């Protein structure tokens, strides 16, 4: 609040304008980064009420209805595990909207595969989508269909191990 200090500071020119402009550029760049990462779909996809995906369980990654924040258990664990003229500007996208974007991406990739990323979301059964992914890596569809229960059990076990590993590693 010193007037004499500001009068002497004016002798140095537009240094303050340069610093404010650089900080403003960084601040808008962070919002641009968040838009580029999370806002890649213009449709908010939602999962069907019946979670019949041929044995595949997505409860640990889909949003929890019981939580007011509408986050997944994994996302909730992630949020729990992260702890003089200065101002902190809030991010343009809040945490619930970022969670909504991730939920839309999850719903699109579960119900439609990769179709929603290239155009209109085309529905496909999830085992058939997994079979398409199997064909992408050079494994025949029959292998997926014959061992579908085993593949679903392995996927659920791996997702649970991911949650346990995140909860058990500082």
Ligand X SMILES: *[C@@H]1O[C@H](CO)[C@@H](O[C@@H]2O[C@H](CO)[C@@H](O)[C@H](O)[C@H]2NC(C)=O)[C@H](O)[C@H]1NC(C)=O
**Binding footprint of other proteins, residue count (CB under 8 A):** 40
Contacts of 74 by beta carbon, 8 Å cutoff, 6+ apart: 60, 61, 162, 163, 166
Interface with other proteins, residue 120, by CB under 8 A = yes
Instruction: Please identify which residue in 34, 47, 57, 148 interacts with ligand X, judged by CB under 6 A.
Output: 57
Total length of the chain = 170
Interface with other proteins, residue 118, by CB under 8 A = yes
Of 48 and 160, nearer to other proteins (C-beta) is 48
Nearest residue to 61 (alpha-carbon basis) of 111, 123, 124, 106: 106
Interface with ligand X, residue 32, by CB under 6 A = no
What is the distance of C-alpha 91 from the center of its chain? Answer: 15
Identify whether the C-beta of residue 76 lies closer than 8 Å to the C-beta of residue 64.
yes
Instruction: Please identify which residue in 51, 81, 133, 161 interacts with ligand X, judged by CB under 6 A.
Output: 51
Sign of the Cα torsion 135, 127, 64, 108 reads positive
Of 57 and 148, nearer to ligand X (C-beta) is 57
Question: Where do contacts with other proteins occur on this chain (CB under 8 A)?
Answer: 39, 41-48, 52, 54, 97, 100-101, 104, 107-108, 110-112, 115-116, 118-125, 127-128, 131-132, 140-142, 145-146, 148
């Amino acid at each position: 609040d010193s007037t004499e200090c500001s009068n002497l500071l004016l002798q140095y020119g537009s240094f303050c304008t340069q610093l404010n402009r650089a900080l403003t550029g960084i601040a808008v760049e962070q919002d641009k980064n968040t838009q580029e990462v999370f806002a890649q779909v213009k449709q908010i996809y939602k999962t069907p009420p019946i979670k019949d995906f041929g044995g595949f369980n997505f409860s640990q990654i889909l949003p929890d209805p019981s939580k007011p924040s509408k986050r997944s258990p994994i996302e909730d664990l992630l949020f729990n595990k992260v702890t003089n003229g200065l101002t902190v500007l809030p991010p343009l996208l809040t945490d619930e909207m970022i969670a909504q974007y991730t939920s839309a991406l999850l719903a699109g990739t579960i119900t439609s595969g990769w179709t929603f990323g290239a155009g209109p979301a085309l529905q496909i059964p999830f085992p058939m989508q997994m079979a398409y992914r199997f064909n992408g890596i050079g494994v025949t569809q029959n292998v997926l269909y014959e061992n579908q229960k085993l593949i679903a059990n392995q996927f659920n076990s791996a997702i649970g191990k991911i949650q346990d590993s995140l909860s058990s590693t500082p």
